[PDB]
Every structure is written in structure tokens, then in C-alpha cells.
């Protein structure tokens, strides 16, 4: 008489990603903030845990290609949904940039962001280091802000339900007022979603506050969270209706909607759900130009490549006029990753591997060794899920000249915040902040420009009505 | 300690419909068989329990749009994909036509279906009247092929598991050899799906066999998928991937991966599937003038109106000048369903429903009823689910001149092969088979353009490969 434990009836909480993880997965970040403030009333009061609103790809969208100051995005939330618990994702001792930040810098942003009106901090590491999470994860913690210690998800021979218990613990003893388990590559199924999330719950206790972020990229993340409720999760992401699936996320009002009669319920507002649905959807056609065109794609759970890797990859074969081996480099990325110690396949490790992989492909395995990975290999990123092939990092020492080290890389970081703002200050357009100093340490080649074209105000890279007219 | 029993660890069959209902669904049904033929082979040795690929709406579409004859169709998935059980869906006693023919238009019909190669004949009813599906099924069971019984799945105060379950034993009196659950506005919720399969297993026993179509229209069947396999469901329906999602279908490799390490298990070929999957995707784009414009809808849970019938009213609408009163006919729809006995809202019961709504909204509430809202009222059609408002009854009556009937429809229907073959055979271009004599009775106003242009061979109303580079 086979049966299955589920959690007892309950509200399950929902986190919103339409303003932030939704375009930038389904529209390369472009959405202009004039296109998101005409949805903010409604968003604030239909009954989300938080609403995602900042972070990620946003910042460097918001300077690179719509002049548009970040800061004053993440004001501009703060003061539209004044009852929301305003969240985003935060790359650990990496920040928003492109390296790993002296202690104080990261002090520093967390601080303004905090200020600024944050109240819900993901923090996570591309490798699951948690010591690169630790001090971002401490400065949340004195902000008095919430603490979101972040697991991303992956399947590899050394990923393990017991290895992911013991990364919780971990994060639970930074100080992590709550477990993010992240799913970018939609690589979740149902029955492991269950296993992790219980094991975790019966190992920590039901107290335990985890987050389960899936997208949908192989269509069955949506049952994956179903079993996540049953297993107890108590807070799932979901993007509005009309701005999901594919690479994007399960829809917010489906995720709602299919817990009748289940004795699991959420209390979000199907009015406001439905006014959030139409006002993005009378916008997202603007957006056509960078649109994705594949809706479903599983293939993953058998190459263990995203397809935003593979296409990474596939560029550089037909720009190197050999992609007569597509499918040699798909064998060799399996063992890159391997002797990588099997990092998470996501940014930044995902182009790392990818790249060296072609290299291996082409000039010969090993052969040449990019900056980038001799950098992992010698442990500049962090630890990995499991041990480097001690040969191939031999190799890479011998190819960089760097010395293998093992401890936190930001323990070597020397203090640079008085080296930032005095170079920042020499800038045209630099005002003065702090806000404006961490946009130059965060991005030293776009800070410049963005700084003497800001007062034109920020502008949109999407459609107008008349060209969307123009095109019918 | 709350639990949920689910089935023992077992196979689950699946049903592909790229075929047929993939295309009409996402489409209008315009796929031509040369974008088709190619995919057979894989197909047929991916190891599905059944391949949709005829009835429904393609035999209109073949006829009227593809200068196609539907038998040559169903004659080369015969040959094409030799190993594999066809499925068709036949719409009872009305077959693939207009109207209610006599038993002997219906004997025909399946008899040269099955000579010509149809495994498994889905029978329904829309209103889910098992006397408009007796005969058919009967018919089947002479011809030695499986009769699949159909229970349209809607949403209503008088829909219960009770009735589901009441419906699925008087479609086994009838001889049925499995029951089919139709979903086509994907109402079906997860509880529900558990619910309803579990009663009909605990009923009639586990040897029943049940196949469960449900759409993904509302973003929550593929979840109601999993509870249907968890209450035992032997078989679940699915679109390949690169044509699925939308008013489409839930993903066959989807619902094949999402079910490792729960103890199910399909028996597909992920290779076959994914050389399906890439033939429909570098064909697919060639249809773009036939595609959708939404991935998920959920208002029906709210408003009982279907995307595709609340779209005919709107035009209704704005083709009498009136549609500042969209919102008078979404609310009058409710109404009308009610008093004509809340029959399902799927064809043609929708386009009745929702026309008569649209006049009760102007010239008055039943101040003039349409031909088919009056035979619908007054039995013409069969039984409904409920009992018809005597009031509303009497007026079409009254409005029609006919007399209220009960029996099943079919009864009074006098021989009419005879006089079809007749006028059949005076058309330029009949072949004088039954299979053209079948195209005369079933589509009388396209048999006879067709029969003269057929000659030319089937078309394409689809995009050419130059076309598409024209766009770009
Ligand atoms: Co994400
Ligand atoms: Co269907």
C-alpha cells in the first residue's frame, strides 16, 4: 500500500520575478523601467512573499544599454511598492561585478542597498563556495536585512541530497535567515525537488525557511514544485503569466491556480494578478527583437550543457571555421567540468569551461589555458563541489605562473575603496556617492560613459509602438 | 502524519499527437503531410501506445485548405509507420461532419476507417450524451479495433466525480475498451485529476484502462498529469516538444524525464524523440502565420469561457459595432450555458452558446434564438448534463415550430447512403469509392471543389524556406 508523506495544509508563499529575473531570462534584461512602473501598484498589493526587483544582470543592463542609473531603479521600487518585501540576487564576494571585492566593498554595497530600500538579500557563489557568501552574507546580517544563503542546483556525479543538507547547515550557520535552492538550468525533477527539500526540512527542522527558484527551460520544473509543497517548501518563484516559460519561469497565476482542493493554498489577489498580466502583456511585444525561440528543451539532462553554453560554444566553432566538431566539443565539456572539480554550469563558470573546452578541441587539450580557467583550476574562484585533477593544475601553474591557494580568495584582496573613489571622482558626470563609486568599481569600462550621457535620462532599447505598427 | 496513496512503480504509456491535435491546436490544422512524412519512421519506433494522426479537424482542413484527400493521409501513416496503433478522434453519431447521420453513414464511416488502417477510435460527445457515441463504439467493436469511450472534462455546478464516474460505466456498457478523459480547455487540476481517475479505478476496478488528454492552455495540466499517474492513469497524451505549450499540448519529453526516480517510467526512445523534435522544430517556423499569441491563459477558471470562444464573440462584437459590452456577454454567457443544461463549452456547444449570448446582449434575452441554440433546447442534439430550463425550452418551441424530442437523435434519421451515393456521383472528379461518397456526405459545399482540383495534389498554405528568408 505505497503512499507518500506531504506536508499538512498550509499557505505557501510566492516571490515574483517579473521585475527582474523574468525579462532578464526571456528578453536580455532590456526592460525599460517605463514599461515596469505602471505595474508596481498592483504587484505591491497581490500578496507575494517579495517581489525580485534588483541585482543580477539588472545593474550593468541598466548602465550598459538603457543609461539608466540602477540606483535610482531600486529607489523608484522602493517608493511605488512601499508594502513590499523588495528582494535580489547578489553573486557573493563577486557583487554584481566582475571579480571578487576587498571585504569593504562589499560592505559598502550592501550597505547602500540596504539603505536604499533592499530588504531580501539572495546571496550565492557560482561554485557553491560558502565562504565566498560569508561576508556578504554577515553585512545583510548588520544592515538587519534578510539573509537568503543561496544552493545552486546541479546534477553531477559528486551532487548528492547528503552534500546539499550539509551546504544548507553551512549557510544556516553564516547566520542565513533563509535557503535558496536555485535552479537556473531547470534541472530539478520532481522526485529529487521532494528528497532535497524534505531532507533538509527533517535534518534542520520545519522552521527551516527554504526558497525553491526553478525555471522552466525543461518544462517540468512546475511538477518539481508541486513536490517541493508536499515536501514542505515554504516559498516558490513564479513569473506573471505573461511573462513566462521557456528560459523564463513557471507561471505565477498557474502555480496559484492548480493548489486547489489540495489543501495548500497561496493569498495571492487573482484581480491584481490579472491587471500585472495584461499590462505586461500589451508591453512585451516591444521586446520582440530579443525574444529566445525555444520554448522547451530537455536535452540537458543528457549533455549537461545549458543552451546558452552550447550557443556560447557553437559562435565560437563557426567563428573559428571548424564547427564540423560541435560534437567533439560537447564530449570534451563533460571532462573539462570534471577536472574542474564539477562546478555549477552557470555564469561564469559555464563560459570558463565552455571556452577552455574548444581550446582542448582544437590546439590540443590543455594546450593553451585561458586566464579565466588556470584561475579555477588554481582556486582564485573559490573551492569546487570536488577536487581539481591535481595534473591539470599542475599544468595551469605552469601555464600562469600563479600558485595554487585554497582560502578564501578576498583574504589576499588588499583595501580599495580610497583607490575606487578617487579615480571614480575623476570621472565627468561622477556625483559624488557612493552609489556612484561602487557603479565604477563594479564596472570600471562602462562607468565613464554612463556617467557623462545619465542626464539625458534613461532610455529604452525596445520597439516603439509606431515600429511595432510599422512591422504589421 | 498526512499521506497521499499513489500507484506501485510501473510503466506509463504515452500517446503522441504532433500528428493531429499538436497542429490543429497550434496551428488551425494547416500542417501539410510533406512536412509530415518525414518524422514517421522515428515516430513509429519511438514507443508510444497509440499515434494520433487523423480525425478531428484535419479531415476538414485536408479537404477545404490542403487540397488533400484524408483517406491518401491516413493510407501513408499506415504504411509509414507500420508498427505503431493509429488514433483517431471521431465526434460520434455527428463523425468527422456537420450533423447527426444515420447508423449506416456511421457503419460506413468506421468500417473504411479501419480498412483503411485506424487502430484505436476515440469516440466523444459533446454534450457527453453515450447514446451519440453507442452506435459508433458498436461499429468499432464489429471492426475488431479498440473503442476508446470520451468523458469531456468541464468545469460546472453539476459536473462531479459522481457524474465522471457514472459516465465512465455507462461508456463500459457500451463495450468500451478504455475510457478517455478530455480536457481540451485544460480545466483539469491536479486534486481533481487524482480524484476522478482514483474513483473510476476503485469502481470498476484497476483493470480499467484510462487515457487522460488534458491541454496546457491554463499552464496546470502537466501537474495534473502527475496526480493522474499517481491515481493509476495507464495512459497521459503529449505533443514532442518543439510543438507543444500554448493551446498546445504538455511536452512528451517533458512528462517522459520529469517522471525518473518516482518509480514510473515511460518506455520512449530519447534519441527517436529528439530526431522528432528537431524535425518539427526546423519546420515549425514555416507556419508562423497560423501561430497564437499566448502561452498560458487561466481567466477560465473565473469566466468558464475558452480563449478560442470568448475571441468569436469579441469579433461578434466588434462586427455589430457594440463591443462596449464585452462585459454584458462574458456575464449573460454563464446564463445561457445554464439554461441549455450546462453542456460542455467545446465544439460546437461553444460557438451555440456563445452566439446566443451575444444576442441576448442586443436584441434581447431569447427575443430571437438562433437555428442551432433552438435544437440545442429543444433535444435535437441529446441529453445535457443537467435538465434544460422548461422556460427557455418552450420559447424555442415556440420560436421554431419543432417539437422538444429526448430520444437520442439519430433515431428519426431515415437511410440516406443511397441518396448520398447518388449525389456523389454526379460530381466532376468522384472516384466512386465510399471514401468519396463519405467526403460528399460529411462535406458537401468542399467535396465538390476538392473533387476537382485533387487531381493537382495536395498543397501547402504554409510559408516556403524562400518566404521565411524573406521575412529575415
Ligand atoms: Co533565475
Ligand atoms: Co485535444
Known sequence: PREIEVSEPREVGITELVLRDAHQSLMATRMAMEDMVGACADIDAAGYWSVECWGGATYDSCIRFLNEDPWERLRTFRKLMPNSRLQMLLRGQNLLGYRHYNDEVVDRFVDKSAENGMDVFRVFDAMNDPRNMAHAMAAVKKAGKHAQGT??????????????????????????????????????????????????????????????????????????????????????????????????????????????????????????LHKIRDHFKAIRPKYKKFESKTLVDTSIFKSQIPGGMLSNMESQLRAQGAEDKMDEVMAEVPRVRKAAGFPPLVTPSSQIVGTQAVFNVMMGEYKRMTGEFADIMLGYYGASPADRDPKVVKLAEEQSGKKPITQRPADLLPPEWEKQSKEAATLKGFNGTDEDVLTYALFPQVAPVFFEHRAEGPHSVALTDAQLKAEA
Open 151 to 272: 544552493i545552486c542546483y546541479t546534477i553531477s556525479p559528486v551532487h548528492t541530497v547528503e552534500g546539499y543538507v550539509k551546504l544548507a547547515g553551512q549557510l544556516l550557520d553564516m547566520g542565513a535567515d533563509s535557503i535558496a535552492l536555485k535552479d537556473m538550468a531547470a534541472l530539478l525533477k520532481p522526485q529529487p525537488a521532494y528528497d532535497i527539500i524534505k531532507a533538509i526540512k527533517d535534518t534542520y527542522g520545519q522552521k527551516t525557511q527554504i526558497n525553491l527558484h526553478c525555471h522552466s527551460t525543461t518544462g517540468v520544473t512546475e511538477v518539481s514544485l508541486m513536490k517541493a509543497i508536499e515536501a514542505g517548501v515554504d516559498v516558490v518563484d513564479t513569473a506573471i503569466s505573461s511573462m513566462s516559460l521557456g528560459p523564463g519561469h513557471n507561471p505565477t497565476e498557474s502555480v496559484a491556480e492548480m493548489l486547489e482542493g489540495t489543501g495548500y493554498t497561496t493569498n495571492l489577489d487573482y484581480d491584481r
